[PDB]
Amino acid sequence: PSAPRKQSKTYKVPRRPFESARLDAELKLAGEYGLRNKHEIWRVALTLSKIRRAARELLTLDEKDPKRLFEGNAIIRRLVRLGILDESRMKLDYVLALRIEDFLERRLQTQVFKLGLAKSIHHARVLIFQRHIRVGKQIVNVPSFVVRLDAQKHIDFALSSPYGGGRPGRCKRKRLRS
Amino acid sequence: GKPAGLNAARKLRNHRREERWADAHYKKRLLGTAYKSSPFGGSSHAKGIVVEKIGVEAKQPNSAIRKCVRVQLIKNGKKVTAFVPHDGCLNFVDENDEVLLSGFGRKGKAKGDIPGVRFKVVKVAGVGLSALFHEKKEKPRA
Amino acid sequence: GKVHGSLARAGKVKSQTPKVEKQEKPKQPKGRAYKRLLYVRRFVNVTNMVGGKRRMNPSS
Amino acid sequence: RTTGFALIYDDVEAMKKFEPHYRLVRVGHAEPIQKVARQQRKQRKNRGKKVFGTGKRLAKRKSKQQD
RNA sequence: UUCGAUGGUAGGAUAGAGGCCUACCAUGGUUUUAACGGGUAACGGGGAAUUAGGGUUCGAUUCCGGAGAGGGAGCCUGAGAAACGGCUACCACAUCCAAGGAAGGCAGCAGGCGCGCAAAUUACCCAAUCCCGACACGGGGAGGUAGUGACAAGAAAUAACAAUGCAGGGUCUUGUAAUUGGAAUGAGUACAAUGUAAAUACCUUAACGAGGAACAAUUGGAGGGCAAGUCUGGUGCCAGCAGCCGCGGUAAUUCCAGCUCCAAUAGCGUAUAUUAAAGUUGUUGCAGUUAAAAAGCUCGUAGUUGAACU
């Protein structure tokens, strides 16, 4: 109305579309983590590039500068809270050495697969889509949920649905009828 | 060589302005030839009427019949030459079929061995190519 | 050419070629199953290797 | 979680006075309003502007001139 | 510079300075630092695209300022208009006419014709933002909501747990399944609560709702560029394919039919404009003996550059 609603693109197309040394790594990552497509890879590469660019623009200034000191912390707190960085060992230079592997292992899908109840990351994705997952206090219905270091302990099965009881029925009821 | 004085900005800007006209790309943009004398005034596609079919001959080293047609534009009045991509479509296409003409992909240049042809047909009778070919759509009874 | 045109001999091979019917095939998974099938046929179930061929559509 | 707003007027007169009409209809304190369509109302207003006076004089004059 | 072009005096007009206008007196003002004229498919800016940097292109369009309400011109009202959903006359159009006349302007909201490659309903409502008025109470095609789509951005249906022998692998695990079967099934179907001016939708509601047409994923390519066949059949420099190189004259990995594979994915290709690559516009940062390029040579004013020393 009065002002436009800002929208932006999150995925970036690589300059070389059919690099062998890049396609094999992307296919290996997709097969390992059960990603839908490579749009997730593009989006993660895009945000990582944004973080790296901000860190580089910060590091190109001298120390004890008010702007560099003020901005060199906020990225560190965000990374530590999101778990992208470790519980400790920060030096404002670890920001430039992140990987797509750790960014993708930081998603909620990796955590639910690691805890189990699916035997495979694809089944973990199926569980996360079926709304049967109880990640945190509020149910989450997205594999790309970046999970912090505080919501990894509330994950278990749902009270409702056949996996939690509550008169399953459905296919069970059909088999009982037949 | 080139001026390098601290107060030579005007000289450098003027020389660049004069020399940029020698650029083929800059000349083709700034002359306005697309809207002045080009068959297409910047339009991607244009409708027209088939005039006749011409059997152009391929240049060296190839040798074949290109199966081209001549189409008169309805919005400009300029008679141009058209290229039919597939085979066996010149029989389907008759005179006064309300064809649609577009570029060839060489930025207005002749593509391949076809001599003096810069446009290609995309739709016939307002139904589109490759649709009547696979017997999905049929030509209207006009 | 010059002032001539071959409007009668066009599409000779397309008109005279024999026409066959497509071979019947049951349904095939599409999507993440297709990605898993490609992953499963790439390296975990190697059958075409040795010499670096990595052939996926061998000729017969 | 289910969140909403609550506006207690701690009185009946205050609630019945300071309240939107659709809110009053939702509580169902009084009967709704049955009127003509918006287009019909606007057209009737236009005809009323075209006619100057009470309105029956035009009918009287038309009857006099046509009978 | 006539018929105001530059300046002075005096006056007129304006709400007000002012050659805005008038009478007289002087010939002045700009310009190679590009005056003036012409073109602009030029409303300007905040801004947008590409992004080492420098740059290049675009910007009618959600915000600000200017202009217009078919082209001009004049005028009343009003503080405020040279107003057009105010008026008047001409120019080009349209209309009822009884032939005396009358009467208008959607580059506003909807809808129609035509130009077209190219772009939506003759819908609901003042409930939210605000505006107007005599004013809690009225109105507002401003504005909010919805119907329509292939595309403008963000999230994700087309699956999956085992028994099974073979290829196996090293007693733990993948694949071809004319195989089964009990599972979690969501798209829809209905209904309830919520949502909203009324709704639609979202969220949410028990419950019905797959055993294979389950409720069949497509778009391009498979010589190099650039990833994936010298496979089987038809033609034989013909049809044609083809962004360039290039393939085709009876063994066609490049023509058309089948099989399979490769890339993206509910999206893909094509045509055009533009950007990066373009160190092929080069201030950064080009090149000039032979690839394009040192005036035949000299003087010379703008312009550029200008020894050291306080």
User: Within 13 A of B9's CA, how many CA atoms are on the CB side?
Assistant: 2
Going by their DSSP bridges, the two strands B99-103 and B79-83 should be labelled as unpaired
Tell me, what DSSP letter sits at residue B21?
G
The first and second tokens of residue B33, run together, are 């030839």
For B93, which residue in chain C has the nearest alpha carbon? C7
Size of interface B-C (CB pairs under 8 A): 33
Angle between helix A108-115 and helix A121-129 axes, rounded to 10 deg: 110
Indicate the resolution in Å.
Answer: 2.4
Q: How far apart are alpha carbons B51 and B70 in whole angstroms?
A: 5
* Token pair listed for C18: 């024999």
The distance of Cα A61 from the centroid of its chain, to the nearest Å, equals 31
Q: Distance from residue A158 (CA) to nucleotide E56 (C1'), in Å?
A: 58
Nearest alpha carbon to residue A153 among A123, A120, A115 = A115
Query: Around A18, how many Cα atoms within 13 Å sit in the side-chain half-sphere?
Result: 0
> What is the C-alpha separation between D14 and D21, in angstroms, rounded?
14
CB-side neighbour CA atoms (13 Å) of C15: 9
Breaks (C-N over 2.5 A) in chain B follow: none
Which residue shows structure tokens 């601290």?
A: B6
**Which of strand E's nucleotides are less than 7 A from any protein C-beta?**
33, 41, 62-63, 115-118, 124-128, 136, 140-141, 143-144, 152-162, 167, 174-176, 182-186, 194-198, 206-214, 216-217, 220, 222, 226-231, 233-235, 237-248, 255-266, 270-275, 278, 280-284, 286-288, 294, 303-306
CA pair distance A23, D53, nearest whole angstrom: 85
Residues 26-85, chain A, CB closer than 7 Å to nucleic strand E: 26-27, 36-40, 43
CA A46 centroid distance within chain: 13
Exposure string of D44-63, with b = 16+ CB inside 10 Å and e = fewer, is: eeeeeeeeeeeeeeeeeeee
Length of chain C: 60
Q: Using what technique was this structure determined?
A: cryo-EM
Name A173's Cβ contacts closer than 8 Å, sequence gap at least 6.
none
Token pair recorded at residue A113: 């697969």
Token pair in block for residue C37: 């099938």
Whether B96 contacts B50, CB under 8 Å: yes
Q: Is the CB of A1 under 7 A from strand E?
A: yes
Q: Is the CB of B106 under 7 A from strand E?
A: yes
| Dihedral (CA of A130, A134, A136, A137) sign | positive
Beta bridge partner(s), residue D11: none
Q: How far apart are CA B126 and CA A47, in angstroms?
A: 46
Evaluate the omega torsion of the peptide bond into residue B115 and state whether it is cis, within 30 degrees of 0. no
Is the CB of B22 within 7 Å of strand E? yes
Burial class (CB in 10 A: 0-12, 13-18, 19+), D14: exposed
Map residue B82 onto helix, strand or coil. strand
C-alpha–C-alpha distance, residues A49 and A164, integer Å: 42
Helix (H, G, I), strand (E, B) or coil at B79: strand
